[PDB]
């Protein structure tokens, strides 16, 4: 380890969210539930407020 | 002399004669003075009225917070809102704390809600008049028959 919180977490496609099988992306320092094939993010949070 | 007294058919409630009856139209070229608007959803949700409902539903409360959040970013100055009574006003503000509606309003304008005691009401209006003139215009969340509706 380089003491930098490296290695991006595993990304899992197609995850339901109250009858909405969108897409939950696990980046580096924050979480982002990307709404299918788009550029924005519906559920936008980070690795702190959880 | 009253401006809000326009329905004259119910005026004989006092049981007094009144032969002098006349309205007022005020001929004005540009109608940019006022702009009455009525929002009632319609054939999309039809949930906007709550005359005998408290916290049994969340469709009307969500519509009151979505429209108020958008108007807080387009009005050039302050916004003076009014609710029904003290019971429905407290249930609407408390419901915004769970979904996260009142928290976004605090980002733009400053919140001002009418209290119950008369001592804390006079000091609350002075803070609203100071913020709207010096900095950004705040917002008023009071009651139609409270204390900021008699004559401000």
């Amino acid at each position: 380890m380089a003491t930098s919180s490296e290695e991006v977490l595993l990304i899992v496609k197609k995850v339901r969210q109250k009858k909405q099988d969108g897409a939950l992306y696990l980046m580096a320092e924050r979480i982002a539930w990307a709404p299918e094939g788009k550029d924005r993010f519906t559920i936008s949070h980070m690795y702190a407020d959880i | 002399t009253s401006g809000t007294l326009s329905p004259l058919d119910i005026y004989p409630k006092i049981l007094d004669f009144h032969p002098v009856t006349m309205a007022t139209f005020t001929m004005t070229l540009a109608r940019v003075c006022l702009c009455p608007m009525i929002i009632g959803r319609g054939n999309d949700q039809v949930a906007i009225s709550s005359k005998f409902e408290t916290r049994e539903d969340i469709a009307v409360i969500r519509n009151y917070g979505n429209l108020l959040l958008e108007m807080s970013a387009v009005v050039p100055d302050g916004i003076v809102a009014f609710f029904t009574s003290y019971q429905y006003m407290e249930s609407t503000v408390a419901s915004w704390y769970e979904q996260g509606i009142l928290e976004n309003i605090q980002r733009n304008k400053l919140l001002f809600i009418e209290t119950q005691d008369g001592a804390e009401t006079s000091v609350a209006l002075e803070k609203y008049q100071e913020a709207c003139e010096n900095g950004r215009g705040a917002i008023l969340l009071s009651v139609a028959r409270g204390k900021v509706s008699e004559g401000i």
């Binding site: 897409a23 299918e36 094939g37 788009k38 | 039809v46 949930a47 009307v60």
Partner: protein, 634 residues
């Protein structure tokens, strides 16, 4: 011999159709259709009258204004593909009765003004006097009250049939009374024998149980794709029997429960199979209290409260076997005609023949019928229309607005034509049996493409399922490349866990299904579908499977595409007979269609059957496979 009725009027065949020999009055009005557009843009685009009996209205720019003018014009014949771009077709037959409530003499004046100094020939003018708006209403009379609409031509032409043979107004819009209650079956056959059509409306006053008639439901309505179909099917308190079109992957069984609350009718759900029992029951839980009050299930071995409730979920009329089912089907048919006669909810009726529809109306005395089918025609038939017994075509939704909102996946159709293998083509024109079907089905040139399409989506870990009509054909397609597979003759306990291994507790990605594991217990709902065979008997069953399986990658798509849909069709195998008919249906769904005959990149890929020696060993196995290998019964 001994069967010469009427009809027999269409006549158009051959390459030289030269349909220009009888027009009488048409050449004189051809010049008038040119000088009018030269004035203003509004004084143009007429209707283009034809000597046969059809007009071409506006369809180039339907926008929002002209989208409502055709809704009244289509309210007379069957529903043609309205939401298109070419020309909207309009006729006048059958359906001009259970549609709106205006006379045909009023819509004629609007057509003459659109042509701008010109009458629409004159053949269809004298026809506007057949079917009218008539029906029956159930009220306090506890039977039938004869009053329809405020119009007047709908009552004059009726006295010379029913009132001349039997009275009616005996008890105590021009309303009538009840004629001894029993007299009712003879009236339904005397009105349709002439020319007018009946349409029994709503309202009732017999057999009550669920407290009152307003139950409990939140008034906050949502989903604009269901409210627009609700006001069109039942938006005036009348009946208007027909079939509405709605997306499959949005809630087909959800619009029926919501409509049953506004209609306020003790409806009866009639599913198509076993999967329709659990779907309709799920909507009576999170939306009403009927699940634990007035619930009933005559199928799937339940019999929950046979007496005391009318809202039940059955399966058409498949519960009536001869001798084997004697007293079982008798108690179901007798006890249903007494405490139930509401709405006949129907779903997926484009594959059910007319023989089953006769037994549906016989075992129950429903006064109304409901149509919930997204397809247009039935069993791909254009010469015989058997939809007049379960409700004809009523209204279809705008697929362009449904797809560009978040109701269906962005289907990107692209046909893939693969060359035919020479080793398997020699035996195709050699034998004259049914064994030649598996020859072009097991095409090694298509198997390499079928494996390439799976690898093309394997890196994109997308929900992909290869479809196949044959049962013993998709088995080899999964063993050669190490993947699981399911088919018909398997086991109920085995498919119970494998079906959950794709939606509930998944663990396998590439699964091969057929025509059994889709409308039996749970919907597939994948994303990418591959069609191998395109010549089977199910020429219309895969139409609704395109909407149920191909779901979006979220549920509320904005404006971009992502879902893919390919099709593997063999070359020089007499398969274009069905590959051509699919183009007429895809252009009406708003899907992008294209043809890609060369994948360009299939050879440079680590696939199987690379050498010619492996393709030769498959010939010794396909011909050796016995055709009797099908189930195990005698």
């Amino acid at each position: 011999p001994g069967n010469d009725p009427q009809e027999a009027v269409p006549s158009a065949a051959g390459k030289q159709v030269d349909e220009s020999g009888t027009k009488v009055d048409e050449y004189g009005a051809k010049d008038y259709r040119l000088q009018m557009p030269l004035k203003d843009d509004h004084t143009s685009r007429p209707l283009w009258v034809a000597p046969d009996g059809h007009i071409f209205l506006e369809a180039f720019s339907p926008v929002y204004k002209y989208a409502q003018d055709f809704l009244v014009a289509i309210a007379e014949p069957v529903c043609r593909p309205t939401h298109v771009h070419e020309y909207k077709l309009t006729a006048y037959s059958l359906y001009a009765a259970v549609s709106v409530g205006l006379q045909t003499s009023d819509i004629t004046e609007y057509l003459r003004k659109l042509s701008k100094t010109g009458v629409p020939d004159g053949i269809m003018q004298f026809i506007k006097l057949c079917t009218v708006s008539y029906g029956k209403v159930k009220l306090v009379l506890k039977h039938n009250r004869y009053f329809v609409e405020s119009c007047h031509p709908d009552v004059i032409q009726h006295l010379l049939q029913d009132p001349v043979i039997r009275e009616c107004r005996l008890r105590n819009t021009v309303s009538f009374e009840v004629k001894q209650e029993m007299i009712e079956e003879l009236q339904k056959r005397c009105i349709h024998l002439e020319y007018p059509l009946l349409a029994e409306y709503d309202f009732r006053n017999d057999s009550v149980n669920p407290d009152i008639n307003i139950d409990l439901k939140p008034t906050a309505v949502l989903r604009p794709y269901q409210e627009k179909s609700l006001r069109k099917m039942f938006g005036n308190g009348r009946a208007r029997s027909g079939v509405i079109v709605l997306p499959c992957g949005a809630g087909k069984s959800l619009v029926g429960v919501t409509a049953a609350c506004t209609v306020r009718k003790r409806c009866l759900v009639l599913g198509n199979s076993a999967v329709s029992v659990e779907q309709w029951k799920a909507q009576f839980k999170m939306w009403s209290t009927i699940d634990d009050s007035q619930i009933c299930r005559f199928t799937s071995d339940a019999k929950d409260k046979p007496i005391g409730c009318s809202v039940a979920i059955s399966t058409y009329s498949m519960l009536g076997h001869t001798t084997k089912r004697s007293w079982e089907a008798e108690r179901v048919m007798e006890w249903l005609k007494t405490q139930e006669w509401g709405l006949m909810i129907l779903d997926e009726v484009h594959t059910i023949p007319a023989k089953m529809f006769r037994r549906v109306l016989t075992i129950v005395q429903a006064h109304c019928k409901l149509g919930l089918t997204a397809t247009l025609v039935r069993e791909d038939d254009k010469i015989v229309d058997l939809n007049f017994l379960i409700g004809p075509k009523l209204y279809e939704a705008n697929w362009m607005e449904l797809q560009n909102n978040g109701y269906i996946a962005k289907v990107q159709c692209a046909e893939v034509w693969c060359p035919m293998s020479p080793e398997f083509y020699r035996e195709y024109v050699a034998i004259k049996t049914k064994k030649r079907i598996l020859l072009y089905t097991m095409n090694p040139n298509k198997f390499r493409a079928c494996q390439f399409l799976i690898k093309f989506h394997e890196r994109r870990n997308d929900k992909i399922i290869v479809f196949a009509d044959n049962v013993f054909a998709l088995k080899e397609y999964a063993i050669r490349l190490n993947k699981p597979y399911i088919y018909g003759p398997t086991s109920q306990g085995e498919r119970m866990q494998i079906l959950q291994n794709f939606k509930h507790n998944p663990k396998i990605n590439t699964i091969f299904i057929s025509k059994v594991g889709d409308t039996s217990f749970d919907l597939p709902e994948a994303n990418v579908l591959i069609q191998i065979s395109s010549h089977g008997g199910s020429r219309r069953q895969e139409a609704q499977r395109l909407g149920r399986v191909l779901r979006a990658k979220k549920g509320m798509v904005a404006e971009e595409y992502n879902a893919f849909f390919y099709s593997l069709v063999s070359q020089d195998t007499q398969e274009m007979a069905y590959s051509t008919k699919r183009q007429r249906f895809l252009v009406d769904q708003g899907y992008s269609f294209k043809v890609i005959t060369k994948l360009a990149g299939m050879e440079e890929e680590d696939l199987a059957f690379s050498t010619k020696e492996e393709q030769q060993q498959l010939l010794q196995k396909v011909l050796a496979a016995t055709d009797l290998d099908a189930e195990e019964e005698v």
